[PDB]
């Protein structure tokens, strides 16, 4: 019954995703995030096993809800006359990867390795559960600063994972692959790998490689910071113009740059001062 369950706090953020508030679960003082989405602004709608009409986001979150801490967890949701309200886990203290990179600059490679591996494990979990996120980027990744653990957030542009072609997209253009820009056609996993290349470059360089369609299409990658030969190779591989030339998730995690990753806790002790 909503009001008697949560104590609503300050606005955490807003945007294409909705409006997200800090909240507390009254029953156990649990930190939560309360995300509101207007029905009018809802892209596409889904399908609960019981068959009520909910936004796809709800569908996707439930499909990826489990013990695994690499993806945000949906705890409850409500329907209102003009909106849906999502109760989500909130780590505390937390900071997003965009803010982290803004505050700290280009990340040491040891750190970018730990973070990127964890992103890979989380996207693999999504795909495994039939979910394609479709907006992988620094802003949609939270860092649980205590545990050195990353969380994927905002599945509001996601879809069910299919093996046929997608002709629709509404994630972040600068993270979208050349085949979306040129043809308005992509395949889930290979588009995901492209965005993973953009994000890796973002971590090691402190900014994204392309701002304009022409740059995305041309595919030429310039390194503005000192980046190791192996990291450069991995990044350029993910950012292959032909989708079919892109690494599989397995090929990425077998890549030599990806060897000897730190544990999340190790990562926090060293790089998060914990």
From Swiss-Prot:
Modified positions (Phosphoserine) in chain numbering: 66, 229
Entry keyword set: Apoptosis, ATP-binding, Cell cycle, Cell membrane, Cytoplasm, Host-virus interaction, Kinase, Magnesium, Membrane, Metal-binding, Nucleotide-binding, Nucleus, Phosphoprotein, Proto-oncogene, Serine/threonine-protein kinase, Transferase, Ubl conjugation
Catalytic activity: L-seryl-[protein] + ATP = O-phospho-L-seryl-[protein] + ADP + H(+); L-threonyl-[protein] + ATP = O-phospho-L-threonyl-[protein] + ADP + H(+)
Disulfide bonds: none
Enzyme class: transferase
CDD domains (alphabetical): STKc_PIM1
UniProt PTM: Autophosphorylated on both serine/threonine and tyrosine residues. Phosphorylated. Interaction with PPP2CA promotes dephosphorylation. Ubiquitinated, leading to proteasomal degradation.
Induction pattern: By interferon-gamma (IFNG). Strongly induced in leukocytes by the JAK/STAT pathway in response to cytokines. Induced by different cellular stresses, heat shock and cytotoxic agents.
Gene Ontology molecular function: ATP binding; manganese ion binding; protein serine kinase activity; protein serine/threonine kinase activator activity; protein serine/threonine kinase activity; ribosomal small subunit binding; transcription factor binding
Domain Protein kinase, chain residue ranges per copy: 6-258
EC numbers: 2.7.11.1
One Pfam family linked to the record: Pkinase
Tissue: Expressed primarily in cells of the hematopoietic and germline lineages. Isoform 1 and isoform 2 are both expressed in prostate cancer cell lines.
Coiled-coil features, chain-numbered ranges: none
Nucleotide-binding found in the keyword field: yes
Domain of life, source organism: Eukaryota
Function: Proto-oncogene with serine/threonine kinase activity involved in cell survival and cell proliferation and thus providing a selective advantage in tumorigenesis. Exerts its oncogenic activity through: the regulation of MYC transcriptional activity, the regulation of cell cycle progression and by phosphorylation and inhibition of proapoptotic proteins (BAD, MAP3K5, FOXO3). Phosphorylation of MYC leads to an increase of MYC protein stability and thereby an increase of transcriptional activity.
Annotated protein name in UniProt: Serine/threonine-protein kinase pim-1
């Amino acid at each position: 019954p909503l009001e008697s369950q949560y104590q609503v706090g300050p606005l955490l953020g807003s945007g294409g995703f909705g409006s997200v508030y800090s909240g507390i679960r009254v029953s156990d003082n649990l930190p939560v995030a309360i995300k509101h989405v207007e029905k009018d602004r809802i892209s596409d709608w889904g399908e609960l096993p019981n068959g009520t009409r909910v936004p796809m986001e709800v569908v996707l979150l439930k499909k990826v809800s489990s013990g695994f801490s690499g993806v945000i967890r949906l705890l409850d949701w409500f329907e209102r006359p003009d909106s849906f309200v999502l109760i989500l886990e909130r780590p505390e203290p937390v900071q997003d990867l965009f803010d982290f990179i803004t505050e700290r600059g280009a990340l040491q490679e040891e750190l970018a390795r730990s973070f990127f591996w964890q992103v890979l494990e989380a996207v693999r979990h999504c795909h495994n559960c039939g979910v394609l996120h479709r907006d992988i980027k620094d802003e949609n990744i939270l860092i649980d600063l205590n545990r050195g653990e990353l969380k994927l957030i905002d599945f509001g542009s996601g879809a069910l994972l299919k093996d046929t072609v997608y002709t629709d997209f509404d994630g972040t253009r600068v993270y979208s692959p050349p085949e979306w820009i040129r043809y308005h056609r992509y395949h889930g996993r290979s588009a995901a790998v492209w965005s993973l290349g953009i994000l890796l470059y973002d971590m090691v360089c402190g900014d994204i490689p392309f701002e304009h369609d022409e740059e995305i299409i041309r595919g030429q990658v310039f390194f503005r910071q000192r980046v190791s030969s192996e990291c450069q190779h991995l990044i350029r591989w993910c950012l292959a113009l032909r989708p079919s030339d892109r690494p599989t998730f397995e090929e990425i995690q077998n890549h030599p740059w990806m060897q000897d990753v730190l544990l999340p806790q190790e990562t926090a002790e060293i790089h998060l001062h914990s």
